[PDB]
Amino acid sequence: KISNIFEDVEFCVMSGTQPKPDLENRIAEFGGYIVQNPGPDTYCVIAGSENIRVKNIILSNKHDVVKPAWLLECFKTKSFVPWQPRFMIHMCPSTKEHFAREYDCYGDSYFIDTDLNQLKEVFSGIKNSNEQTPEEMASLIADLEYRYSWDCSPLSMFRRHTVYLDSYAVINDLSTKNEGTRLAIKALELRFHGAKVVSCLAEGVSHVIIGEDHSRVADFKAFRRTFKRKFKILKESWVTDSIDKCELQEENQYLI
Amino acid sequence: MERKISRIHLVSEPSITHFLQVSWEKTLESGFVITLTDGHSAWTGTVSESEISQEADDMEMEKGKYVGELRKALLSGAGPADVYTFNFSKESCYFFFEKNLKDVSFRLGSFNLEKVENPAEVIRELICYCLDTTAENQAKNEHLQKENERLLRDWNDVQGRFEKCVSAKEALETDLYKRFILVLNEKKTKIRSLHNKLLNA
Amino acid sequence: MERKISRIHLVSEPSITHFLQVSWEKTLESGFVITLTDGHSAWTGTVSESEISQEADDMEMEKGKYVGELRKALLSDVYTFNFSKESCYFFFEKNLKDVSFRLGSFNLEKVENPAEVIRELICYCLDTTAENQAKNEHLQKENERLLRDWNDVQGRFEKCVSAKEALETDLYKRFILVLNEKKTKIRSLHNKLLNA
């Protein structure tokens, strides 16, 4: 019937059911053979979804398991499309090693420059993981900008600042929060340009930001005599003037 | 216990302003008291729940409707349309007021006023209440105008910041990509060179 | 034309309420008209630009805390008013802690309509009061509308900041995996070099 790129090529389809028998049927109208469990001549298994045979087929390493989107480019190109990482769910040892010569385990070449396209595609198979905390992401990010001189970028203008905004009628008392305030909007601006904003004044905050109420200024300067790391107190208009000229004004203008 | 001072003109007195003060508890329909004055004298009187009902009955007019008309006549509740007319004899002390529609005049109700004994004094009380009234509404205005300013400056300010932030965020992904590609392809320069030297090794 | 209205007492009649009303033209400094009433009778007085600043000269002083002492003392426990209907002399003096001294004193000259004067003054209140009520209503509905909008932009800016935070993290997370793979590769080859 419609082609035989697949003729004399044996396939196991384990998942499915994008549906397990649709694909076996389609394979079958490209000249190709189906087989209920894998064997010494089955070419690859096709893998729509995680599963019992599948999960298991991977745990042995005889076969090499490929996404359904591969067959669908073959069906669409009427051609026998060479395998590309983006296709592989799992690689059998021999094939793994053939592809570890040219490619990363995510699919980036060692030897050929990437691209917008090509890297989007790489990026595109991963979902993470959590293996990462906001505090953690921050430093990693921060050190990479430092490494690469991205640390003056606007959107990163404040990574290195850890800021307490005077948003609580009682310092550090979460239930005294003043809401719907020009200062609520300053927390958003600071965060949007990389700042770490903190609802607790404690050792390690580098900056505290006042607006128009100076009622707690003296508490702050009193707190700060007890700190080791001696935060600055700054006017709200610091943050605006920094963002408006797309780089840090700095601070001694804006003291206190 | 609401009151309501309203300035009028008598048909008898075209140019001279006159003041009507009504007073009640909170309906008008429950009855009300009703001083007139011109600066210089002062007349009073009382109307009652049922006198009102009778008056309406006389006019063959639905009661809400009628009280409608009373509030608008007596409380400065008048629409653009509405023309109301006020008539008083010092001499007979009779007060009546009417509405004027298709060039007819329609009497809306009447009063028996009783000229008042202490004139310069109720005037005093009256015009203390106005000072208090004007001062309250003044101060509330000063406050509302300041909030209006606050609010208008702060809305203008988030609107701009916000939109500048939506642009920057929408250009971010590609931007990161581009920084990532230059870094990875420099890495790959270094891979190639080491690999070739290993070939020649 | 400015103006200002003000309830007072006299020591001459301790137990009741009077009204002083001070009017002027574009400043208190041009000079001014001043009026007093019991609710019944009409008292007036014109003290203008030439003997206004001759006050602070025959006293040698800052017009400053004369002018400003008057306006405190006039335009509204411790000023003190005394007037007599026969002479028309009206004086006030600043009452201090255990001293006392003299501040001001129009030789008024009253007028003939005690009604025309009470008319302008009740009106003033009502006109000024009704004017504010209208504006206060509009301002109040304007301000609810400005707050609604403000609150909406706030919630949309909150989501845009979370989205920007999440977009970077996700994208750095997938970068550091790929970058790492270039450095490990660079390490083998470097080592494997040193060895061949």
XYZ file of C-alpha atoms in Angstrom:
653
model
C 0.000 0.000 0.000
C 1.469 3.448 0.549
C 5.237 3.045 0.501
C 8.021 0.787 1.605
C 10.731 2.650 3.062
C 10.163 0.108 5.979
C 10.152 -3.056 3.972
C 12.046 -5.847 5.774
C 12.377 -3.698 8.838
C 10.892 -5.073 12.098
C 9.343 -2.956 14.665
C 8.111 -3.372 18.236
C 5.497 -0.846 19.193
C 5.049 -0.990 23.034
C 3.385 2.415 23.552
C 0.697 4.005 22.584
C -2.231 2.884 23.096
C -1.309 8.282 19.134
C -2.584 4.870 19.429
C -0.704 1.628 19.621
C -2.528 -0.066 16.778
C -2.765 3.038 14.621
C 1.042 3.170 14.424
C 1.441 -0.496 13.947
C -0.990 -0.168 11.048
C 0.801 2.770 9.560
C 4.142 1.083 9.940
C 2.541 -1.722 8.131
C 1.398 0.329 5.163
C 5.136 1.515 4.739
C 6.295 -2.024 4.080
C 7.321 -2.837 7.582
C 6.922 -5.709 10.057
C 5.452 -5.635 13.578
C 6.487 -8.175 16.339
C 4.820 -8.332 19.820
C 7.992 -8.406 21.918
C 11.556 -7.485 20.777
C 14.131 -9.812 19.516
C 17.533 -10.042 17.869
C 16.344 -8.298 14.589
C 13.895 -5.936 15.828
C 15.105 -2.595 14.662
C 13.724 -0.423 17.561
C 10.713 -0.190 19.874
C 8.402 2.733 19.713
C 7.449 4.410 22.934
C 4.464 6.822 23.180
C 4.074 6.761 27.039
C 5.975 5.348 30.234
C 4.956 1.628 30.862
C 5.361 -2.020 32.051
C 6.935 -3.680 29.030
C 8.665 -0.404 28.304
C 10.095 0.500 31.654
C 11.195 -2.994 31.741
C 12.601 -3.130 28.060
C 14.837 -0.186 29.041
C 16.115 -1.985 32.237
C 17.577 -4.642 29.887
C 19.706 -2.930 27.358
C 19.176 -4.972 24.276
C 17.071 -2.335 22.502
C 16.974 1.038 21.767
C 13.594 2.893 22.089
C 12.504 5.766 19.880
C 9.830 8.281 19.888
C 6.682 8.044 17.704
C 7.514 11.483 16.200
C 10.349 9.746 14.349
C 7.881 7.489 12.495
C 5.736 10.434 11.829
C 8.487 12.290 9.945
C 9.232 9.181 8.038
C 5.445 8.944 7.231
C 5.329 12.680 6.394
C 8.652 12.795 4.360
C 8.015 9.357 2.836
C 11.558 8.811 3.761
C 13.617 6.814 6.144
C 14.726 9.756 8.332
C 18.115 9.235 10.069
C 17.876 9.037 13.770
C 18.655 12.327 15.646
C 18.862 12.468 19.489
C 15.534 14.372 19.556
C 14.051 10.962 18.573
C 15.643 8.728 21.190
C 13.927 7.630 24.315
C 16.684 5.164 25.319
C 19.910 3.872 23.752
C 21.206 0.431 23.749
C 25.049 0.430 24.313
C 26.292 0.241 20.849
C 24.132 3.130 19.659
C 24.802 5.225 22.713
C 28.435 5.199 21.907
C 28.088 5.930 18.356
C 26.106 9.093 19.456
C 28.323 10.060 22.390
C 31.114 10.640 19.847
C 29.265 13.538 18.198
C 26.644 14.548 20.849
C 26.055 15.482 24.463
C 23.583 13.451 26.246
C 20.938 16.217 25.559
C 21.651 16.291 21.980
C 24.183 19.254 21.552
C 27.127 18.571 19.225
C 30.533 18.650 20.509
C 31.855 19.832 17.124
C 29.247 21.852 15.269
C 28.135 25.357 16.455
C 24.463 25.418 17.679
C 21.844 27.805 16.615
C 18.654 29.284 17.824
C 16.659 26.560 16.248
C 18.916 23.604 17.126
C 19.286 24.802 20.773
C 15.656 25.390 21.353
C 15.114 21.790 20.294
C 17.817 20.597 22.772
C 16.340 22.709 25.487
C 12.996 21.328 24.620
C 13.457 17.818 26.035
C 14.214 18.044 29.951
C 11.588 18.944 32.792
C 13.280 19.799 35.814
C 13.813 19.496 38.979
C 13.959 20.891 41.821
C 17.106 19.871 42.789
C 16.930 23.696 42.894
C 15.917 26.235 45.423
C 15.310 29.917 44.585
C 18.411 30.909 46.776
C 20.398 28.392 44.712
C 19.253 29.395 41.303
C 20.144 32.972 42.304
C 23.892 32.169 42.900
C 24.270 29.967 40.008
C 22.746 32.650 37.864
C 24.839 35.353 39.611
C 28.104 33.519 39.140
C 27.372 32.788 35.477
C 26.695 36.661 34.865
C 29.893 37.386 36.741
C 31.795 34.749 34.759
C 30.368 36.045 31.450
C 30.028 39.811 32.285
C 26.262 39.707 32.044
C 26.057 41.390 35.478
C 25.325 44.809 34.171
C 22.421 43.722 32.245
C 19.306 45.689 33.348
C 17.252 42.725 34.137
C 20.129 41.625 36.457
C 21.041 45.153 37.669
C 20.267 44.212 41.306
C 21.285 40.417 41.610
C 23.813 41.192 44.110
C 21.577 43.339 46.344
C 19.458 41.445 49.144
C 16.743 43.953 49.992
C 14.308 44.592 52.770
C 11.591 46.997 51.941
C 9.915 48.744 54.716
C 6.562 47.205 53.981
C 5.641 46.210 57.598
C 4.270 48.503 60.211
C 6.379 46.369 62.578
C 9.691 45.425 61.206
C 9.894 41.642 60.437
C 6.274 41.158 61.529
C 4.514 39.568 58.571
C 1.093 40.347 59.761
C 1.600 44.091 59.885
C 2.189 44.218 56.077
C 1.041 47.557 54.547
C -0.621 46.408 51.240
C -1.313 48.449 47.946
C 1.594 50.874 48.453
C 4.107 52.437 46.173
C 6.499 50.285 48.115
C 4.619 47.056 47.028
C 5.398 48.209 43.517
C 9.009 48.867 44.319
C 9.344 45.174 45.456
C 8.066 44.235 42.135
C 10.606 46.387 40.302
C 13.455 45.291 42.343
C 12.529 41.649 41.747
C 11.972 42.058 38.143
C 15.596 43.475 37.709
C 17.225 40.514 39.590
C 17.034 41.766 43.270
C 16.610 39.262 46.082
C 13.786 40.785 48.189
C 13.336 39.598 51.830
C 10.468 39.932 54.229
C 12.837 39.561 57.133
C 15.634 42.069 58.241
C 18.479 39.850 59.311
C 22.236 39.604 58.776
C 23.063 39.516 55.037
C 20.617 42.093 53.710
C 22.770 44.563 51.956
C 20.023 47.308 51.530
C 16.843 48.495 53.128
C 14.491 50.639 51.213
C 12.373 53.449 52.816
C 9.621 55.437 51.086
C 7.906 58.438 52.557
C 7.146 57.214 56.099
C 10.498 57.588 57.943
C 8.759 56.372 61.167
C 10.967 53.190 61.431
C 14.313 54.726 60.295
C 15.650 54.948 63.754
C 14.631 51.295 64.560
C 16.545 50.308 61.454
C 19.668 52.175 62.378
C 19.257 50.725 65.845
C 18.959 47.202 64.339
C 21.981 47.755 62.193
C 24.266 48.587 65.148
C 23.690 44.904 66.012
C 24.522 43.593 62.549
C 27.896 42.383 61.256
C 27.144 43.447 57.685
C 25.945 46.915 57.912
C 23.227 47.502 55.332
C 22.534 50.781 53.586
C 19.333 52.693 53.937
C 18.104 54.078 50.750
C 15.511 56.128 49.162
C 12.845 54.480 46.985
C 13.974 56.868 44.100
C 17.281 54.905 43.890
C 15.536 51.953 42.396
C 13.573 54.147 39.961
C 16.608 56.288 38.871
C 18.695 52.917 38.422
C 15.973 51.225 36.270
C 15.277 54.538 34.314
C 18.969 54.832 33.224
C 19.213 51.099 32.816
C 22.088 50.905 35.288
C 22.887 51.367 38.929
C 22.928 55.056 40.083
C 24.519 54.754 43.267
C 23.922 54.927 46.651
C 25.304 57.840 48.474
C 23.005 60.232 46.787
C 20.167 58.252 48.227
C 21.230 57.625 51.804
C 18.767 57.465 54.570
C -32.939 63.510 62.232
C -32.004 65.187 58.972
C -32.432 68.876 58.206
C -31.942 70.705 54.887
C -31.622 74.466 54.322
C -32.453 75.403 50.711
C -32.435 78.981 49.406
C -35.632 80.198 47.511
C -37.376 83.250 45.980
C -40.931 84.204 46.713
C -43.217 85.138 43.824
C -43.894 88.356 45.995
C -40.113 89.130 46.105
C -38.260 88.528 42.712
C -34.789 89.836 43.683
C -34.712 89.097 47.540
C -33.360 85.621 48.633
C -35.148 83.722 51.420
C -34.288 80.476 53.159
C -36.306 77.483 53.717
C -35.211 75.094 56.397
C -36.818 71.782 56.667
C -36.078 69.196 59.367
C -37.399 65.693 60.048
C -36.585 62.119 61.035
C -35.793 60.018 58.461
C -38.596 60.228 56.330
C -40.257 63.401 55.053
C -43.447 61.372 54.889
C -43.511 61.104 58.698
C -44.099 64.949 58.981
C -41.585 67.854 59.165
C -41.001 71.333 60.582
C -40.355 74.208 58.366
C -38.849 77.613 59.036
C -38.643 80.454 56.509
C -36.567 83.608 57.088
C -35.177 86.587 55.220
C -32.212 87.721 57.448
C -34.393 90.080 59.381
C -37.568 87.907 60.452
C -38.492 84.190 60.824
C -41.683 82.079 60.435
C -42.313 78.382 61.317
C -44.863 75.541 61.244
C -45.300 71.761 61.111
C -46.807 69.304 58.669
C -47.857 65.803 59.658
C -47.802 62.255 58.325
C -51.468 62.381 57.435
C -51.965 65.994 56.188
C -49.393 64.814 53.578
C -51.532 61.741 52.733
C -54.638 63.869 52.361
C -52.920 66.495 50.170
C -51.856 63.562 47.912
C -55.367 62.246 47.947
C -56.642 65.674 46.965
C -54.377 65.483 43.925
C -55.409 61.997 43.006
C -51.721 61.103 42.968
C -49.962 57.894 44.058
C -48.163 58.464 47.450
C -44.531 57.619 46.550
C -44.925 59.930 43.553
C -46.256 62.726 45.785
C -43.444 62.473 48.350
C -41.137 62.352 45.291
C -42.496 65.822 44.471
C -42.255 67.035 48.023
C -38.519 66.173 48.352
C -37.763 67.857 45.047
C -39.765 70.983 45.973
C -38.675 71.292 49.588
C -35.117 69.866 49.633
C -33.606 71.344 46.450
C -34.034 67.914 44.706
C -35.133 69.594 41.411
C -34.178 68.164 37.998
C -33.186 70.459 34.988
C -36.786 70.176 33.819
C -38.493 70.990 37.151
C -39.741 74.519 37.822
C -41.151 75.145 41.314
C -42.794 78.242 42.657
C -42.970 79.618 46.225
C -45.594 81.902 47.647
C -45.934 83.618 50.965
C -47.951 86.348 52.629
C -46.190 87.979 55.511
C -49.682 89.133 56.360
C -51.794 86.023 56.203
C -48.715 83.886 56.953
C -49.860 81.302 54.358
C -47.223 79.337 52.398
C -47.936 77.513 49.266
C -45.710 76.098 46.620
C -46.381 74.800 43.212
C -44.973 73.177 40.147
C -45.057 74.731 36.655
C -45.528 72.342 33.697
C -47.341 72.961 30.398
C -47.686 76.671 31.310
C -50.037 75.543 34.056
C -49.302 76.050 37.633
C -49.952 73.107 39.885
C -50.188 73.682 43.539
C -48.148 71.113 45.414
C -49.013 71.868 49.037
C -49.606 74.609 51.669
C -48.480 75.796 55.102
C -49.604 77.660 58.089
C -46.548 79.534 59.364
C -46.560 81.247 62.804
C -44.229 84.244 62.922
C -41.576 83.580 65.377
C -40.848 85.361 68.600
C -36.970 84.998 68.845
C -35.823 85.976 65.275
C -32.008 86.846 65.436
C -31.529 83.566 67.443
C -32.862 80.759 65.282
C -30.978 82.642 62.500
C -27.935 82.113 64.775
C -28.554 78.425 65.193
C -29.308 78.082 61.493
C -26.135 79.848 60.455
C -23.968 77.991 62.920
C -25.068 74.779 61.288
C -24.101 76.148 57.937
C -20.588 77.090 59.024
C -20.297 73.488 60.344
C -21.677 72.085 57.178
C -19.469 74.187 54.850
C -16.392 73.378 57.009
C -17.048 69.616 56.900
C -17.523 69.514 53.150
C -14.525 71.739 52.728
C -12.296 69.510 54.676
C -13.669 66.403 52.984
C -12.860 68.005 49.673
C -9.332 68.817 50.617
C -8.853 65.190 51.496
C -10.549 63.723 48.370
C -8.548 66.024 46.092
C -5.262 64.931 47.719
C -6.260 61.220 47.287
C -7.271 61.952 43.806
C -3.651 63.331 43.173
C -2.011 60.418 44.930
C -4.027 58.008 42.991
C -3.586 59.615 39.598
C 0.211 59.876 40.111
C 0.480 56.306 41.221
C -1.718 54.881 38.535
C 0.430 56.781 35.801
C 3.492 55.394 37.359
C 2.631 51.680 37.513
C 1.113 51.859 34.044
C 4.423 52.985 32.531
C 6.648 50.740 34.705
C 4.445 47.819 33.957
C 4.386 48.059 30.227
C 8.164 48.696 30.111
C 8.439 45.458 32.078
C 6.149 43.431 29.764
C 8.360 44.464 26.775
C 11.588 43.543 28.486
C 10.146 40.249 29.555
C 8.874 39.425 26.148
C 12.389 39.933 24.658
C 14.078 37.970 27.486
C 13.940 34.314 26.258
C 15.676 35.061 22.964
C 18.104 37.233 24.653
C 19.200 34.464 27.034
C 19.407 32.101 24.069
C 21.688 34.341 22.299
C 24.012 34.695 25.286
C 23.949 30.822 25.708
C 24.789 30.169 22.033
C 27.916 32.381 22.115
C 29.138 30.720 25.256
C 28.490 27.069 24.018
C 29.980 27.739 20.616
C 33.128 29.141 22.265
C 33.255 25.905 24.207
C 32.987 24.016 20.906
C 35.973 26.023 19.455
C 38.031 24.708 22.259
C 36.631 21.013 21.663
C 37.567 21.208 18.040
C 41.094 22.378 18.642
C 41.823 19.820 21.305
C 40.373 17.120 19.098
C 42.370 17.995 16.062
C 45.563 18.107 18.104
C 44.690 14.757 19.451
C 44.382 13.603 15.809
C 47.654 14.925 14.874
C 48.989 13.245 18.176
C -11.920 88.668 45.723
C -11.216 86.338 48.708
C -13.144 86.265 52.031
C -13.495 84.279 55.318
C -16.247 83.775 57.940
C -15.850 83.215 61.642
C -17.856 82.722 64.832
C -16.726 84.830 67.887
C -17.589 86.121 71.362
C -17.325 89.474 73.118
C -16.423 89.970 76.773
C -19.140 92.653 76.576
C -21.647 89.720 76.112
C -19.999 86.448 77.360
C -23.041 84.101 76.968
C -23.854 84.189 73.192
C -22.584 83.818 69.539
C -21.635 86.519 67.000
C -20.082 86.419 63.565
C -17.090 88.240 62.202
C -16.516 88.072 58.553
C -13.357 89.235 56.921
C -13.238 90.014 53.128
C -10.290 91.103 50.897
C -9.040 91.578 47.366
C -6.284 89.249 46.049
C -4.363 89.778 49.312
C -4.897 90.896 52.921
C -2.225 93.367 51.989
C -4.283 95.526 49.567
C -6.390 96.167 52.710
C -9.908 94.846 53.394
C -13.555 95.006 54.580
C -14.572 93.541 58.008
C -18.135 92.915 59.268
C -19.755 91.784 62.579
C -23.248 90.571 63.486
C -25.414 89.139 66.259
C -27.891 87.616 63.792
C -29.901 90.857 63.983
C -27.737 93.965 63.295
C -25.227 95.303 60.726
C -21.588 96.417 61.574
C -18.914 97.201 58.890
C -15.422 98.696 58.488
C -12.867 99.518 55.733
C -9.115 99.421 56.650
C -6.975 99.573 53.405
C -3.534 99.779 51.425
C -1.563 102.846 52.762
C -2.489 102.737 56.465
C -2.248 98.952 56.410
C 1.559 99.171 56.023
C 1.619 102.352 58.150
C 0.628 100.054 61.092
C 3.925 98.121 60.970
C 5.764 101.509 60.790
C 4.142 103.382 63.695
C 4.975 100.075 65.394
C 8.326 99.756 63.458
C 7.679 96.043 62.989
C 7.638 93.066 60.644
C 4.265 93.466 59.020
C 5.116 89.741 59.405
C 3.817 88.759 62.832
C 1.434 91.682 62.828
C -0.280 90.858 59.553
C 0.246 87.151 60.589
C -0.900 87.791 64.172
C -4.067 89.431 62.894
C -4.882 86.625 60.396
C -4.352 84.130 63.273
C -6.345 86.438 65.539
C -9.015 87.284 62.994
C -9.469 84.592 60.440
C -9.654 82.314 63.618
C -7.845 80.086 73.803
C -6.593 83.246 73.389
C -7.605 86.244 71.468
C -10.338 88.358 72.939
C -12.985 90.513 71.316
C -14.693 93.608 72.563
C -16.967 95.966 70.672
C -19.326 98.693 71.560
C -22.454 99.470 69.545
C -22.597 103.219 70.630
C -18.933 104.103 69.801
C -18.336 101.317 67.268
C -14.861 100.775 68.605
C -13.814 97.171 68.140
C -10.642 95.964 69.833
C -8.882 92.634 70.411
C -5.757 91.836 72.369
C -3.401 88.829 72.416
C -3.773 87.081 75.842
C -0.500 85.514 77.092
C 0.691 83.435 80.065
C 0.621 86.046 82.930
C 1.221 89.180 80.749
C -1.440 90.605 78.283
C -1.090 93.207 75.470
C -2.646 95.108 72.568
C -3.132 93.831 69.081
C -5.787 95.717 67.104
C -8.811 97.969 67.103
C -11.105 99.211 64.356
C -13.137 102.227 64.877
C -15.965 100.587 62.820
C -18.989 102.471 61.302
C -22.087 100.200 60.994
C -24.607 99.972 58.064
C -28.289 99.948 57.425
C -29.210 96.331 56.186
C -28.849 93.684 58.861
C -30.583 91.380 56.315
C -28.555 92.028 53.061
C -25.540 91.035 55.198
C -27.037 87.881 56.760
C -28.279 87.015 53.239
C -24.673 87.076 51.732
C -23.464 84.994 54.489
C -25.962 82.257 54.676
C -25.651 82.059 50.882
C -21.923 81.793 50.978
C -22.144 78.771 53.175
C -24.801 77.062 51.048
C -23.162 77.872 47.694
C -19.715 76.766 49.023
C -21.198 73.820 50.666
C -23.243 72.709 47.633
C -20.269 73.192 45.311
C -18.079 70.898 47.425
C -20.657 68.267 47.625
C -20.795 67.837 43.872
C -17.019 67.777 43.451
C -16.740 65.369 46.436
C -19.094 63.016 44.735
C -17.204 63.042 41.491
C -13.858 62.757 43.219
C -15.150 59.870 45.165
C -16.202 57.867 42.184
C -13.098 58.903 40.282
C -10.954 57.617 43.102
C -12.665 54.185 43.297
C -12.145 53.901 39.645
C -8.333 54.853 39.827
C -7.939 52.346 42.734
C -9.700 49.569 40.865
C -7.415 50.069 37.866
C -4.358 50.339 40.047
C -5.179 47.136 41.722
C -5.586 45.397 38.411
C -2.175 46.536 37.068
C -0.707 45.500 40.290
C -1.997 41.842 39.886
C -0.838 41.734 36.240
C 2.608 43.103 37.124
C 2.827 40.473 39.917
C 2.156 37.694 37.393
C 4.680 39.247 34.839
C 7.406 39.217 37.499
C 6.721 35.592 38.540
C 6.733 34.650 34.798
C 10.097 36.423 34.222
C 11.572 34.700 37.375
C 10.310 31.210 36.253
C 11.475 31.893 32.574
C 15.028 32.602 33.619
C 15.346 29.732 36.075
C 13.974 27.186 33.686
C 16.227 28.444 30.910
C 19.426 28.673 33.141
C 18.612 25.186 34.475
C 18.823 23.724 30.905
C 21.901 25.849 29.996
C 24.008 24.782 32.948
C 23.271 21.052 31.952
C 24.311 21.619 28.363
C 27.352 23.889 29.364
C 28.547 21.340 31.747
C 28.643 18.743 28.997
C 31.058 20.866 26.965
C 33.447 21.231 29.901
C 33.486 17.559 30.887
C 34.150 16.782 27.134
C 36.880 19.519 27.235
C 38.316 17.760 30.236
C 38.638 14.298 28.676
C 40.169 15.658 25.542
C 42.656 17.770 27.545
C 43.609 14.933 29.756
C 43.693 12.470 26.826
C 45.864 14.950 25.011
C 48.382 15.228 27.839
C 48.519 11.487 27.724
C 49.095 10.903 24.015
